Amino acid sequence: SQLANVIRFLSADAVQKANSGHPGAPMGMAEMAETLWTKFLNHNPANPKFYNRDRFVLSNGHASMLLYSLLHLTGYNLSIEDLKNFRQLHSKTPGHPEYGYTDGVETTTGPLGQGIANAVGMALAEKILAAEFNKDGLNIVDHYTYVFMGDGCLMEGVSHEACSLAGTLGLGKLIVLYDDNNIGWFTENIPQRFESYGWHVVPNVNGHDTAAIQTAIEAARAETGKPSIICCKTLEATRKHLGWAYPAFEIPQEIYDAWNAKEKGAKLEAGWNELFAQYQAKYPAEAAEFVRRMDKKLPENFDEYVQTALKEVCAKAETVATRKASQNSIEILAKELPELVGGSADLTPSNLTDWSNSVSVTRDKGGNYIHYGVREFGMGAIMNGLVLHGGVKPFGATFLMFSEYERNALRMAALMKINPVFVFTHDSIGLGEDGPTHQPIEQTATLRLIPNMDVWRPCDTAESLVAWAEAAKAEDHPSCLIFSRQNLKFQARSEQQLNDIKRGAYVISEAQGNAQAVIIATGSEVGLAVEAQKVLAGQGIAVRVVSMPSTSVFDRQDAAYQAAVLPEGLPRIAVEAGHTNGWYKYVGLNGAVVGINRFGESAPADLLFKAFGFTVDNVVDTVKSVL
Ligand SMILES: [Ca+2]
Ligand SMILES: [Ca+2]
Ligand SMILES: [Ca+2]
Numbered sequence: 001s002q003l004a005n006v007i008r009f010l011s012a013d014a015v016q017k018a019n020s021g022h023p024g025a026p027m028g029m030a031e032m033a034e035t036l037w038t039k040f041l042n043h044n045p046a047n048p049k050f051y052n053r054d055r056f057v058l059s060n061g062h063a064s065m066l067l068y069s070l071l072h073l074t075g076y077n078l079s080i081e082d083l084k085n086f087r088q089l090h091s092k093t094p095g096h097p098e099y100g101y102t103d104g105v106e107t108t109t110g111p112l113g114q115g116i117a118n119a120v121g122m123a124l125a126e127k128i129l130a131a132e133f134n135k136d137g138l139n140i141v142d143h144y145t146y147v148f149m150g151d152g153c154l155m156e157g158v159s160h161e162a163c164s165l166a167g168t169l170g171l172g173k174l175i176v177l178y179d180d181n182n183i184g185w186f187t188e189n190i191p192q193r194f195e196s197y198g199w200h201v202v203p204n205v206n207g208h209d210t211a212a213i214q215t216a217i218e219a220a221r222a223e224t225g226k227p228s229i230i231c232c233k234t235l236e237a238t239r240k241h242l243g244w245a246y247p248a249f250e251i252p253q254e255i256y257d258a259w260n261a262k263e264k265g266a267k268l269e270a271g272w273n274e275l276f277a278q279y280q281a282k283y284p285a286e287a288a289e290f291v292r293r294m295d296k297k298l299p300e301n302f303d304e305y306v307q308t309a310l311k312e313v314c315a316k317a318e319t320v321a322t323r324k325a326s327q328n329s330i331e332i333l334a335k336e337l338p339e340l341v342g343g344s345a346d347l348t349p350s351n352l353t354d355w356s357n358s359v360s361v362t363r364d365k366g367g368n369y370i371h372y373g374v375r376e377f378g379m380g381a382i383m384n385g386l387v388l389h390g391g392v393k394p395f396g397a398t399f400l401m402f403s404e405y406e407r408n409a410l411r412m413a414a415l416m417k418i419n420p421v422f423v424f425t426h427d428s429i430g431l432g433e434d435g436p437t438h439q440p441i442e443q444t445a446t447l448r449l450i451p452n453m454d455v456w457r458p459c460d461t462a463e464s465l466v467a468w469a470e471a472a473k474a475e476d477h478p479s480c481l482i483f484s485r486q487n488l489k490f491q492a493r494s495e496q497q498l499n500d501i502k503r504g505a506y507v508i509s510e511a512q513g514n515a516q517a518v519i520i521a522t523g524s525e526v527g528l529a530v531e532a533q534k535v536l537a538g539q540g541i542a543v544r545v546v547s548m549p550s551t552s553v554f555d556r557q558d559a560a561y562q563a564a565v566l567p568e569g570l571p572r573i574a575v576e577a578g579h580t581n582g583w584y585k586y587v588g589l590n591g592a593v594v595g596i597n598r599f600g601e602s603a604p605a606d607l608l609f610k611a612f613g614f615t616v617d618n619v620v621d622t623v624k625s626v627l
Contacts, residue, residue, distance in 0.1 A: 004034040004210070005244040006073065006255050011065035013248040014086040014093070021087060021095060025179065026066035028207070028234040029148060032177050035213040036146055037070055037261075040221075044265030045075040048103045051294045051390065052143050052272045055106050055122045059115025059149040060179070061096040066148075068093050071104045073251075073259035078102065080249050099388065099416045107388050108416045111408050113156030114381040116176065119147045120162040121385020121394075123174040123227070124361070124370070128341065129391045131366025133290055138279045140272075140290065144221070147176045151186055154178070158409075161378025166227045167197035170363035174227040175220045179207070181234045190231060200228040207232030225363075293339045294390040298473065305336050306469040310498060313461050317490045322483040322523070323425040325464035327352035330395075333468055334358075334368075337393060341386060343370035344397040344423075345379050351397035351425045370394075376402045380409030383420040387413075393472060397423035399431075400440040400482055403447060413478040414452040421471045422480045427457070428577035429612060430486045430524055435602030442579040447480050449582075454479040454552040457523035457576075460490045463549045466501040470553070482523065486605055489527045491547070504553025505546055505565050509533055513542035517571040517623055520546045520586060525575045525594075525614065532575075532619035543623060544570075551582075571626040575619055577609070592622045 011026035042054045058067045065086065071078045078092060085091035092102055096110035106122070109115040123145040130141035153159050166174055178190065191203040200223040202216040213232065220228030239245065246252065280287035292299070299305070309332045318325075334340050334355050344353040348371070359367035372379040379396045386394040403410065403424055413420050429439045448455045454477060456467035464483070471479035491508055500506035505520070509530055521529035529545045536543050546565055548554055554562065566572060572591040574583035580595035587593060596612050609615070 001243060002255060003038065003258060004030040005242055006251060006259070007033055007066060007069040008242070009239060009244045010069040010072070010083060010249070010251070014065050014068070014083045017084060017248070018087040021065065022062055023065070025060060025063035025150065026069070028181055029063065029066055029179050031208045031210055032148065032179070032213060032232050032234075033066055033070055035210045036177065036217065037074065038259070039214050040144075040217055041146065042143065042268055043074075043104075043261065044269045045104070045261050046265060047269055048076065050269050050272070051290075052141065054143045055119070055145045055389065057107055057109070057115050057119040057122070057145070057147045058097065059109055059119070059147055059153050060112065061109030061115060063148075064093075064095060064097045067097050067105065071102070073256065074261040076104045078104075084249060099418075107385065108412060111412065112152040113158035114384070114409060114412060116147055116149050116153055116159050117162035117378055117381030117409075118385035118388065119145050119174060120166045120171065121382040122389045123166070123171045124169065124382065125386045125389035125392050126173060127169070127171060128361060128366050128368070133286060135279070135283055135286070138275065138282070140276055140279050144173045144175060147174070148179065149176055150179045151182065154188070154190060155186055158377040158381055161375035162382060163194065163199065163227070164197050165373060165375060165378060165382070167199050168363065169361065170198075170225050171227045172224040175217065176227070176229040177213075178229055178231050179234055180231050190229070194229045198226060200226040202228065202230040205230055205232050207234035289338065290391070293392070296390055296475070299336060302336065302473065306465070310462060310465055313465050314493065314498065316461070317492070318461055319487055319489045320461065321485055321487050322458055322460070322464050323352045323485060325458070325461040326423065326425070326468070326481065326483045327355065328461060329465045329468040331355040332465060333472060337472065339391065339393045341368045341370065341392045341394045342396070343372050343379065343394070345372045345376045345402070346374045347398055347425070350399070351423060353395070353397045353423060370396070372396060376405035377409060380406030380422065381412070384409060384413050384416065384418060387418045387420045388416070393419070393421075395421035395423050397425060399426045399438060400424035400443050401426070401438050403443055403480070410447070410453065410478065410480070411450055414450050417452060417476040418478065419471075419474050419476065420478050422478060423483070424480060425483045426485045427482045428484065428524060429596065429600045429608040430484055430577065430605045432485070432605035432608065433602055436599040439600030440578065441596055441599060444482055444576075445579045445582040448551055452477045454550055455482065456480065456550045457482045458549045459521075459523050459526035459547055460488055462490070462493060462498060463501050463547070467549060470502050484524045486524065488524055491526060491530070501549060502553070503557050503561060504550040504555070505548035507544055507565060508547040509545040511542040511544045512537055515542055515544040515567075515570055516627060517543045517573060518546055518566060519543055519573050519575060519619070519623065520548050520566075520583070521575040522548050523576070525577055528614060528616065528619060529575050531616050532623065535616055535620050536623060541624070541627070573619070573623050573626060577614055590626060592626050594619055594622050
């Protein structure tokens with residue numbers, strides 16, 4: 001009894017001291033927490049990165065004191081003083097748990113619905129890695145993914161997407177305990193809804209009866225072919241009434257001793273280490289790849305591999321759409337990165353995200369390609385879970401417009417400092433007839449405003465490969481790779497220019513003579529800028545052309561490099577088939593921009609580019625206007 005009550009009142013006491021947060025949810029889930037963590041959860045406080053630990057996700061991240069209490073009591077590096085600093089500036093206990101900051105936190109939750117989607121990704125990674133690595137009974141990948149979620153989570157559409165897909169893929173090691181704390185706007189029959197996803201459902205569990213919860217979890221674990229949801233019905237004075245009379249933050253040694261998990265955790269990891277040694281004796285190359293990939297490290301020869309492939313891409317000098325350049329880059333990277341896991345939100349023939357060796361993940365088998373269905377938000381938040389798990393490097397594609405359907409998952413990846421790769425195709429009015437509901441205008445500009453996010457808009461096959469390789473190399477941030485539907489002309493480059501692509505912007509065509517201005521262009525508009533430079537030169541007006549595949553990356557280059565690309569006092573003109581307003585950061589009040597700030601139109605692409613002023617004459621006149 002007191003083992004649940006200590007969680008209950010540690011939470012209430014820390015919330016009270018902070019005078020911020022909600023104490024009811026952690027208090028209602030204390031028996032659920034006690035049951036899962038003392039009877040089932042396999043974890044080692046001495047090594048929060050133990051490869052085969054069970055993964056726990058508190059999807060209703062507002063109940064954060066529940067998780068902080070559990071980490072403290074079981075012996076993680078989180079102290080009473082840390083709990084006394086709940087929600088205080090720079091404390092180890094922010095109001096929502098933060099991955100990478102606090103040992104034992106598996107994901108950053110707060111925005112509702114995404115936690116269960118993260119967990120689906122973690123369970124998917126376990127399934128994928130188990131199919132790939134486990135061999136003749138040596139099951140080095142074998143752990144569960146447990147989730148606590150609440151009513152807010154279940155109302156959100158992203159929970160529908162993630163749990164629907166989890167049902168189709170038969171994720172039997174995903175086990176959800178739902179805090180059903182209800183007796184107007186929420187009347188769903190949750191057991192019936194989750195039956196319709198193909199889940200195993202344990203309804204009507206007494207959420208304060210540890211015997212009932214343990215039996216339900218046992219039933220969930222036995223259902224190996226379906227994810228499970230367990231519907232847990234939950235409900236100073238209350239303190240001594242519930243039998244907890246210790247003052248705030250006082251915990252007796254006997255209760256710390258009963259809760260401590262270091263002895264059991266150590267024996268767990270030692271037992272796994274013995275299994276991995278048997279595995280390493282029989283499968284040493286696989287064993288070494290498992291460690292590399294779980295450690296989230298790239299192959300030692302990655303850069304030399306990419307450099308060789310880039311030289312070959314240049315030898316081909318293909319004029320293709322960069323969505324095809326993307327598929328070519330994926331092929332190149334996949335040879336080198338066995339951890340690569342692709343997918344698309346029902347746009348595989350459009351995003352061009354499969355490669356020659358992609359194997360679709362199914363209910364019965366592993367693979368390296370996920371058909372997410374028409375579920376962009378689910379895809380983004382599932383990819384966050386895939387990358388948090390370790391062992392795989394996911395990418396997932398949709399049309400650039402539908403970045404808006406998964407927008408907060410993109411932001412949460414950046415906040416968590418993780419490195420999923422978000423792929424987007426059909427990036428401008430250049431997509432043509434599908435019209436203004438699909439034609440991006442402002443999306444690329446808005447994506448650039450996400451802190452700790454790299455946005456790449458490569459102009460040809462060479463920039464596309466560099467963008468992919470840089471996205472794959474980045475250790476602590478995500479990337480958006482933005483690709484065109486229409487063919488883009490390959491640009492010739494020196495060896496130095498090729499090597500400067502990774503600096504985000506570079507001079508792709510210097511002026512013949514002293515530059516009178518600089519044209520900054522990205523993606524599909526570089527060719528237009530180069531053509532305008534030639535027309536201007538024929539009029540005796542010398543300008544330089546700068547390709548800026550990533551503003552994000554250019555902005556963190558040293559000042560000398562940025563000045564070498566964009567010299568002070570040289571008028572700047574930006575050309576991009578999107579909203580103009582972000583370019584004033586570069587061109588200022590006396591520069592200019594060739595862009596589009598209104599909605600698109602349903603028509604062939606060539607006509608739209610002409611109608612909206614993406615023409616040589618307009619770029620030339622605009623350049624002249626700032627001289
Ligand atoms: Ca909730
Ligand atoms: Ca409720
Ligand atoms: Ca119209």
